[PDB]
């Protein structure tokens, strides 16, 4: 009985492979070989934040391109002012094991989560004068790996129990759950128009999800190991993924195959964080060799290297105005490059 | 402007508080507790005293923090980086599982020990072993032979010989005999001497690290 289901699944996979092989007439490199290269790119540190005294795991940019939020395993969450290198708030944490953080677009709330299987939402602009916990979301059986703010009342999360969820904040009840993964989900990215979001998991696959409807729409493969990071193109019709096999891949949402592979023989370590730049010409990635790299989104050729850390670079972000790039690592230091 | 000066003063106060809290927290000793399924972990927790469970206890002016991660059930590699700087690992193995099979439980326990001991993250971390269930061990040694678990074994059926064999077999999976070293102790029921052994191991490790850090050798 199960044998004919297995053979039907095999036949469906073969049919879809044969169909998708019929739209690969021209490789992208065949056409993006005549325009001029970007050239060598050099960046230097312009600020350095020296408050943390433990390993740093996550960071996020505010919506005004002037404020920051960072999380580290000393049990603290610090809100920075990048212009003057000041400290605005120092929020304590109940659990010292934190692996994610987020900043609301309205600038009123800050979220964190980790190995305690709870997402905590904090209220910043209060009338008493101190940061206070607002809601504790529970109901996940794995461990949180990412969290983003859809709006001021909705938040999405990804967990290590091969499921993703969307839930309200006023009522701590799950609204929709997305199922279909096999390995642990590691990172997710939200579309600029905020109707769809994509996630990448430990089973060497990336999936697209429809927020309003509730089921998957597409599935992408091509990696030989786990996927650690994933971003979204400013257009909204592409996304890039990082993996432990020391390579980065670009995807297109109207072809359904990978298009570019960025790799080199010198690099042998994995990729931890990925992020884009405005107008889609720069692709920044973090590695385990204590260095960050910048690539051209159209040609695999390297453009520069950021080398200022003494340990593994864990988080990376780019401001909305596209004027600064911030990096945090395991050496308890945050740096801003321009 | 005056407002910027007030902001600078506030930032300096925050920095001072952070430094004080970090200095205070840079003294406690952390240890991670792991086991293999059915084992007497809770007995030890009761003796000395969702995801991570934290237990706090003190004993002559030293503060100990215990982390239990048994109720995780995920890829251990992905979340094992977070425990790099731990002082020691407490491993508990059921000695009475050498007859019961489900592929013997003893083989699973030694596989877990091999996985943890030779991990790249734990290269200088000492491991404290706990042979927990031994109150009825001698009964089933004198009722059933040791050859079922280890047919290659040949020796007398006294409890001394079996205990020595199991200890030397567990300690034989250590690859680095100079960087790290392994403690072993047989756990008794209704016994309050576990904390003393933990203290002795912790102080030995502290002196070991302190001598290695700055001065000789």
């Amino acid at each position: 009985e199960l044998d004919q289901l297995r053979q039907e699944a095999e036949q469906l996979k073969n049919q879809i492979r044969d169909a998708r092989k019929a739209c690969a007439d021209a490789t992208l490199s065949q056409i993006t070989n005549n325009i001029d290269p970007v050239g060598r790119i050099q960046m230097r540190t312009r600020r350095t934040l020296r408050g943390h005294l433990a390993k740093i795991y996550a960071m996020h940019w505010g919506t005004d391109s002037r404020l920051l939020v960072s999380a580290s395993q000393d049990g603290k969450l610090i809100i920075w002012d990048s212009y003057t290198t000041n400290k605005v708030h120092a929020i304590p944490l109940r659990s010292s094991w934190v692996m994610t953080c987020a900043y609301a677009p309205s600038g009123n709330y800050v979220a964190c989560g980790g190995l305690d299987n709870i997402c905590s939402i904090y209220n910043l602009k209060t009338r008493e004068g101190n940061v206070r916990v607002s809601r504790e979301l529970a109901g996940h059986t794995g461990y949180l790996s990412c969290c983003r703010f859809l709006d001021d009342n909705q938040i999405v999360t990804s967990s290590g129990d091969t499921t993703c969820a969307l839930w309200d904040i006023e009522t701590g009840q799950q609204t929709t759950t997305f199922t279909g993964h096999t390995g642990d989900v590691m990172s997710l990215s939200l579309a600029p128009d905020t109707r769809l979001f994509v996630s990448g998991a430990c089973d060497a696959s990336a999936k697209l999800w429809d927020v309003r409807e509730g089921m998957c729409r597409q599935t992408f493969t091509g990696h030989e190991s786990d996927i650690n990071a994933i971003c979204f193109f400013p257009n909204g019709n592409a996304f890039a993924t990082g993996s432990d096999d020391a390579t980065c891949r670009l995807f297109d949402l109207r072809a359904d195959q990978e298009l570019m592979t960025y790799s080199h023989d010198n690099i042998i370590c994995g990729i931890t964080s990925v992020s884009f730049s405005k107008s889609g010409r720069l692709l920044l990635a973090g590695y385990d060799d204590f260095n960050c790299n910048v690539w051209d989104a159209l040609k695999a050729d390297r453009a520069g290297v950021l080398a200022g850390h003494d340990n593994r670079v864990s988080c990376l972000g780019v401001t909305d105005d596209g004027m600064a790039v911030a990096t945090g690592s395991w050496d308890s230091f945050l740096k801003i490059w321009n | 402007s005056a407002e910027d000066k007030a902001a600078v003063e506030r930032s300096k106060m925050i920095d001072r508080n952070l430094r004080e809290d970090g200095e205070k927290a840079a003294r406690e000793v952390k240890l991670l507790l792991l086991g293999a399924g059915e084992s007497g972990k809770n007995t030890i927790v009761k003796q000395m005293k969702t995801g991570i469970v934290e237990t706090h206890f003190t004993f002559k002016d030293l503060h100990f923090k215990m982390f239990d991660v048994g109720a995780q059930r995920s890829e251990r590699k992905k979340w094992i980086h977070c425990f790099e700087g731990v002082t020691a690992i407490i491993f508990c193995v059921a000695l009475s599982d050498y007859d019961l099979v489900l592929m013997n439980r003893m083989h699973e326990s030694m596989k877990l020990f091999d996985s943890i001991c030779n991990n790249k993250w734990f290269t200088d971390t000492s491991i404290i072993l706990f042979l927990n269930k031994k109150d009825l061990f001698e009964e089933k040694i004198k009722k059933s032979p040791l050859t079922i678990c280890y047919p290659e074994y040949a020796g007398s059926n006294t409890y001394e010989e079996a205990a020595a064999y199991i200890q030397c077999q567990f300690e034989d999976l250590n690859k680095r005999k100079d960087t790290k070293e392994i403690y072993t102790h047989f756990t008794c029921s209704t016994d309050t001497k576990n904390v003393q052994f933990v203290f002795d191991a912790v102080t030995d490790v502290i002196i070991k690290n302190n001598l290695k850090d700055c001065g000789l050798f």
Partner: single-chain antibody, 233 residues
Framework: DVQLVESGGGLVQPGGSRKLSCSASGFAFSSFGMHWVRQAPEKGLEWVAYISSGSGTIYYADTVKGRFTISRDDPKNTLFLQMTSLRSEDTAMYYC??????????????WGQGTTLTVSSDIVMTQATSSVPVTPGESVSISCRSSKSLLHSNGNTYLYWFLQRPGQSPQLLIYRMSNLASGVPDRFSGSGSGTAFTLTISRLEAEDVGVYYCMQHLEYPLTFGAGTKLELK
């Protein structure tokens, strides 16, 4: 929720001493800086003293520099002020004001109620107009002028607006020019520019009667304005 109540007053002869106490109730006192503001029986507002959070920097006025003492205690949430020598110009009404300072905060948010006392160079703010007739349904604007420009190189200006209803304590409307406060309707809008500032309200109501005030927060000797009335026939 937030409540500051002051006590200590009566009749003091010249050459005597007196002290005033301010009590607080639950607004994270240890992380707030406090001021003192004095109102003469006729009219006008003036600044007296200031103590920063953490008991660090302390500033006094150029008129009462040598005779006033300001102090605080984070436990018990109580503020103090000491009077050594009293002249005949010290008879006025005293208020307590809280203020905080970070990147996007709003200073001078909550005021007290008052405590009576009877004894028996610097920035100049003009606010030349004194009284203007008004009728509900039409916009009315008020203007004020300052000596020098209040536009620091940071890119932000420092001008504050206050309203004092009859028989009530002052309240904040605009903390920095073109920036609304909390608890106020959206019809208010400062929209000043350069060195001469203005304040426009779109529609009126029975609760908009009172005396308006202007303030500056650039040089720490703080100077208030004169005050304009809205008689509202």
């Amino acid at each position: 929720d937030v409540q500051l109540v002051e006590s200590g007053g009566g009749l003091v002869q010249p050459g005597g001493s007196r002290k005033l106490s301010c009590s607080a109730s639950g607004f994270a006192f240890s992380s707030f800086g406090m001021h003192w503001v004095r109102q003469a029986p006729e009219k006008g507002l003036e600044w007296v003293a200031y103590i920063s959070s953490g008991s660090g920097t302390i500033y006094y006025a150029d008129t009462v520099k040598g005779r006033f003492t300001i102090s605080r205690d984070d436990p018990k949430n109580t503020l103090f002020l000491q009077m050594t020598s009293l002249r005949s110009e010290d008879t006025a009404m005293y208020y307590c004001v809280r203020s905080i300072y970070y990147y996007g905060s709003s200073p001078f948010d909550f005021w007290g109620q008052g405590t009576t006392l009877t004894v028996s160079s610097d920035i100049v703010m003009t606010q030349a107009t004194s009284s203007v007739p008004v009728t509900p349904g039409e916009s009315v604007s008020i203007s004020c002028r300052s000596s020098k420009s209040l536009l620091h190189s940071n890119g932000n200006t420092y001008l504050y607006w206050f309203l004092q209803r009859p028989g009530q304590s002052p309240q904040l409307l605009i903390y920095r020019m073109s920036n609304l406060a909390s608890g106020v309707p959206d019809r208010f809008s400062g929209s000043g520019s350069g060195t001469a500032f203005t304040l426009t309200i779109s529609r009126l109501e029975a609760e908009d009667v009172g005396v308006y005030y202007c303030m500056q927060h650039l040089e720490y000797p703080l100077t208030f304005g004169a005050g304009t009335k809205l008689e509202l026939k």
